[PDB]
Amino acid sequence: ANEVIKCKAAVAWEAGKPLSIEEIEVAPPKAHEVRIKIIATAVCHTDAYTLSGADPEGCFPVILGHEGAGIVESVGEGVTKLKAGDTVIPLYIPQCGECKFCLNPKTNLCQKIRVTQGKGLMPDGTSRFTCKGKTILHYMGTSTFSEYTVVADISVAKIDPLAPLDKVCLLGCGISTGYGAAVNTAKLEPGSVCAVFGLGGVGLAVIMGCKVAGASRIIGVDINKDKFARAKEFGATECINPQDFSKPIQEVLIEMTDGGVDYSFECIGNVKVMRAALEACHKGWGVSVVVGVAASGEEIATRPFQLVTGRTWKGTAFGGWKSVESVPKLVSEYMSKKIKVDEFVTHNLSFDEINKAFELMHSGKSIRTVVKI
Amino acid sequence: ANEVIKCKAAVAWEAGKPLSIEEIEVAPPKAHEVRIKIIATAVCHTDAYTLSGADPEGCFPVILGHEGAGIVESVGEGVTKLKAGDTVIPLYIPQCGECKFCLNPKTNLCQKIRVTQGKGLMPDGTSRFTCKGKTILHYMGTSTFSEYTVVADISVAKIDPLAPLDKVCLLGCGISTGYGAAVNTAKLEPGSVCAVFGLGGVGLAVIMGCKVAGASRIIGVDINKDKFARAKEFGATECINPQDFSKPIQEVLIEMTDGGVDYSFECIGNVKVMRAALEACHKGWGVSVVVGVAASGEEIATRPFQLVTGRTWKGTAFGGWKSVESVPKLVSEYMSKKIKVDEFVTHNLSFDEINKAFELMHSGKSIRTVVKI
Ligand SMILES: NC(=O)c1ccc[n+]([C@@H]2O[C@H](COP(=O)([O-])OP(=O)(O)OC[C@H]3O[C@@H](n4cnc5c(N)ncnc54)[C@H](O)[C@@H]3O)[C@@H](O)[C@H]2O)c1
Ligand SMILES: NC(=O)c1ccc[n+]([C@@H]2O[C@H](COP(=O)([O-])OP(=O)(O)OC[C@H]3O[C@@H](n4cnc5c(N)ncnc54)[C@H](O)[C@@H]3O)[C@@H](O)[C@H]2O)c1
Ligand SMILES: N[C@@H](CCC(=O)N[C@@H](CSCO)C(=O)NCC(=O)O)C(=O)O
Ligand SMILES: [K+]
Ligand SMILES: [Zn+2]
Numbered sequence: 001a002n003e004v005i006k007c008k009a010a011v012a013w014e015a016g017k018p019l020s021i022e023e024i025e026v027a028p029p030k031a032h033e034v035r036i037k038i039i040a041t042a043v044c045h046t047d048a049y050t051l052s053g054a055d056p057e058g059c060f061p062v063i064l065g066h067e068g069a070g071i072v073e074s075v076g077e078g079v080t081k082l083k084a085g086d087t088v089i090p091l092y093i094p095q096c097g098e099c100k101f102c103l104n105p106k107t108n109l110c111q112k113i114r115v116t117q118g119k120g121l122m123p124d125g126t127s128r129f130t131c132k133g134k135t136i137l138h139y140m141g142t143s144t145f146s147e148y149t150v151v152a153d154i155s156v157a158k159i160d161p162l163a164p165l166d167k168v169c170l171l172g173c174g175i176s177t178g179y180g181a182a183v184n185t186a187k188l189e190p191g192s193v194c195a196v197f198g199l200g201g202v203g204l205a206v207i208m209g210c211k212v213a214g215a216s217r218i219i220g221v222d223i224n225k226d227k228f229a230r231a232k233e234f235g236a237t238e239c240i241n242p243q244d245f246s247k248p249i250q251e252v253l254i255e256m257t258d259g260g261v262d263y264s265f266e267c268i269g270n271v272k273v274m275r276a277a278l279e280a281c282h283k284g285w286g287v288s289v290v291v292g293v294a295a296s297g298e299e300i301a302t303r304p305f306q307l308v309t310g311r312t313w314k315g316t317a318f319g320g321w322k323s324v325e326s327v328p329k330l331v332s333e334y335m336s337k338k339i340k341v342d343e344f345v346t347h348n349l350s351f352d353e354i355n356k357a358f359e360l361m362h363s364g365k366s367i368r369t370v371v372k373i
Numbered sequence: 374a375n376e377v378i379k380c381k382a383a384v385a386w387e388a389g390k391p392l393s394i395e396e397i398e399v400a401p402p403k404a405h406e407v408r409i410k411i412i413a414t415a416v417c418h419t420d421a422y423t424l425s426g427a428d429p430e431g432c433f434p435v436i437l438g439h440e441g442a443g444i445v446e447s448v449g450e451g452v453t454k455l456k457a458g459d460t461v462i463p464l465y466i467p468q469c470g471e472c473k474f475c476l477n478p479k480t481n482l483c484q485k486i487r488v489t490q491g492k493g494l495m496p497d498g499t500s501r502f503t504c505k506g507k508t509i510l511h512y513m514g515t516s517t518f519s520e521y522t523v524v525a526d527i528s529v530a531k532i533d534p535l536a537p538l539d540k541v542c543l544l545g546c547g548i549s550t551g552y553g554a555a556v557n558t559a560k561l562e563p564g565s566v567c568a569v570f571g572l573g574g575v576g577l578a579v580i581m582g583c584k585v586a587g588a589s590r591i592i593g594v595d596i597n598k599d600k601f602a603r604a605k606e607f608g609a610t611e612c613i614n615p616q617d618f619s620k621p622i623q624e625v626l627i628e629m630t631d632g633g634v635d636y637s638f639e640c641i642g643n644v645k646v647m648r649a650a651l652e653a654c655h656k657g658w659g660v661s662v663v664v665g666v667a668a669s670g671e672e673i674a675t676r677p678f679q680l681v682t683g684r685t686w687k688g689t690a691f692g693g694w695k696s697v698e699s700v701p702k703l704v705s706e707y708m709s710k711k712i713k714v715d716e717f718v719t720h721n722l723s724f725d726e727i728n729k730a731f732e733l734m735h736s737g738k739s740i741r742t743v744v745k746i
């Protein structure tokens with residue numbers, strides 16, 4: 001039978017404090033849940049956002065992390081598709097396959113367990129984590145910052161058993177989102193001119209997709225010149241820094257493309273930049289995709305004349321991928337060298353140095369840091 | 374050759390005042406210009422919008438009117454495809470047929486003469502109108518409030534001679550716009566749930582459009598409940614008055630539709646309503662098309678979350694119709710009984726009493742009033 005597991009995990013006891021490697025107990029999978037052994041996990045600004053305490057939905061104590069890869073240790077009752085030993089990737093965006101959203105081709109926002117997930121609990125409404133007698137909450141339905149975690153069976157993607165987990169763990173968030181943003185949400189046609197605001201993991205993943213889509217031009221935009229080199233490596237035909245212009249960045253791009261870009265992508269989370277990204281699109285057919293997440297309360301704006309004159313405002317969630325179906329495929333494209341992953345890893349750390357991941361992130365000296373459990 | 378024409382026209386000397394029946398002069402067609410004898414014309418809200426001054430490019434004195442129909446009185450040098458006697462409709466949105474835009478299937482916004490047109494002048498930078506020694510400006514390139522008008526030769530649609538001009542003149546704007554907002558911009562699929570804000574001429578044309586597309590639920594929304602009766606006759610499954618509810622109209626719609634409409638259309642020009650229309654859309658795939666023209670400087674807004682979670686903001690002009698190609702086909706669809714036009718005419722007046730047409734519109738008593746020249 002499946003027993004309780006005593007393992008280590010980086011607990012976030014309180015907002016605004018660093019993570020604490022702690023000894024915890026992980027309960028066995030209940031019906032339609034699977035316990036996974038995380039081999040590798042990366043850190044994203046999203047983890048940091050909840051850690052700061054600025055997140056209205058963030059609760060503590062909790063186990064963060066939503067970018068991991070690992071192996072199925074065991075499954076609860078009712079679980080057929082998965083078995084102990086399967087190589088997998090936890091999914092913050094699930095795919096039950098039967099809800100209103102899963103059944104609609106135009107979205108991937110499965111709602112079967114959203115409510116319970118926002119509260120950091122399994123579908124049965126209870127947490128599977130305990131530490132020093134206290135209950136520790138789940139996070140984004142994944143909690144990848146533990147040697148062992150439990151997720152809803154509808155939150156797992158079975159992937160190629162040969163995929164390096166300390167690499168592929170990044171398909172859990174940033175790469176898939178950026179890539180899908182270009183290929184799924186925008187569906188840019190070969191030869192189109194694109195602009196990308198923000199050159200972090202997401203922006204680079206976007207550039208990657210524009211390049212596979214056959215974009216004729218791909219303009220990178222970032223206030224951090226250091227990001228340019230790698231962007232060019234990814235496919236950016238040219239990079240520009242807003243700080244080097246006195247005119248609004250929209251006007252700059254319009255000049256550079258004789259009207260504006262065919263597609264633009266905001267990968268920062270800055271409401272003002274989002275407006276610029278929209279306005280920088282070509283009149284009559286320009287499309288702008290918002291990929292970045294703005295701080296609660298903040299809102300976007302522009303003159304309706306912009307939409308009336310042909311521009312379209314869009315957005316994306318996890319690159320619009322139906323998680324369970326897509327991720328295994330994305331892994332295969334990686335194995336086939338169709339897409340890049342290794343190139344997104346800028347730093348590697350052991351589980352104890354996990355806090356340094358957050359530090360590298362603020363330094364801006366980082367795209368993605370993979371933490372070996 | 375062609376001589377000057379001494380005729381009658383409704384001149385608007387200054388904003389915020391009723392038009393003035395004046396005896397003007399109309400110069401002959403210069404190279405690539407066409408002089409049209411207007412047989413019938415109506416009043417779109419956009420005409421009043423300009424007459425009030427809220428137009429970013431409203432200059433006076435000017436001869437308004439962009440919904441009309443008549444006969445080609447004569448043509449200027451180089452005009453081959455159009456001859457005297459041709460039954461035509463003046464287009465405020467041209468189709469040069471060769472610019473960057475005309476060649477792109479994703480738009481209908483020819484820019485060939487947009488600049489000059491915005492200033493109320495012919496392509497050569499001059500006006501063909503004069504009254505009491507003072508030069509009078511064109512409007513939207515059509516100026517249909519005159520017995521005779523001169524337009525660019527790329528602002529002319531040659532239609533079926535048999536078409537009743539006192540009817541199809543409405544296809545010059547309102548009807549075609551609303552209809553296309555649904556068929557071209559939204560391209561709504563059969564069975565989709567729709568919401569239409571503003572049940573005027575444009576709104577009913579939107580409903581008519583949703584109906585032909587095979588929409589399931591079509592929810593009309595208007596503060597003037599007297600608009601409901603005809604809305605339902607056009608296809609609205611039901612109407613709701615925003616005032617009869619304490620909750621913001623978005624929540625009402627979200628509640629009625631178990632999440633929001635698949636498509637919404639703002640046909641009023643209210644920036645706050647435009648935001649509601651977008652937020653009334655369903656998560657993951659909702660699309661909102663802005664059709665109404667907003668007052669200078671005003672902007673629409675919302676939390677980017679709305680876009681990130683699946684909703685799309687679009688806009689349209691003249692329903693996205695390639696004017697010179699489409700209008701002729703549109704009157705054909707009217708002739709074949711495929712779309713309605715006659716049911717839009719609620720009043721009829723002579724030229725001398727054109728101001729009454731404006732009063733009725735501000736009174737909300739009409740949809741469209743055809744003024745017999
Ligand atoms: N929609 C989704 O599903 C989804 C998924 C993951 C992440 N995100 C969001 O994507 C955004 C980016 O994530 P990331 O990992 O790539 O983060 P990142 O911080 O590493 O990338 C952002 C880049 O934007 C640059 N930048 C900041 N202000 C700028 C400005 N005014 N103009 C141009 N560039 C500017 C920064 O220097 C940085 O290089 C965040 O909002 C993240 O939360 C969304
Ligand atoms: N994009 C285009 O090409 C295009 C074309 C034609 C018209 N327009 C614009 O579309 C709008 C409608 O034009 P029209 O000729 O049909 O005028 P209209 O007077 O017939 O439309 C106004 C209708 O909306 C209703 N309405 C006003 N405020 C409302 C509110 N707060 N909530 C619900 N309903 C409200 C009015 O009572 C009336 O029923 C105007 O802004 C017009 O300028 C745009
Ligand atoms: N002058 C306004 C724009 C007004 C506007 O949107 N006009 C529509 C037709 S409304 C039908 O009566 C249009 O043709 N848009 C395309 C364009 O104006 O180039 C403003 O500047 O805000
Ligand atoms: K569609
Ligand atoms: Zn992340």
Ligand SMILES: [Zn+2]
Pocket residue numbers: 094095096097098099100101102109110111112
């Ligand atoms: Zn689902």
Ligand SMILES: [Zn+2]
Pocket residue numbers: 417418419420439546547
């Ligand atoms: Zn109009």
Ligand SMILES: [Zn+2]
Pocket residue numbers: 467468469470471472473474475476482483484485
């Ligand atoms: Zn053109």
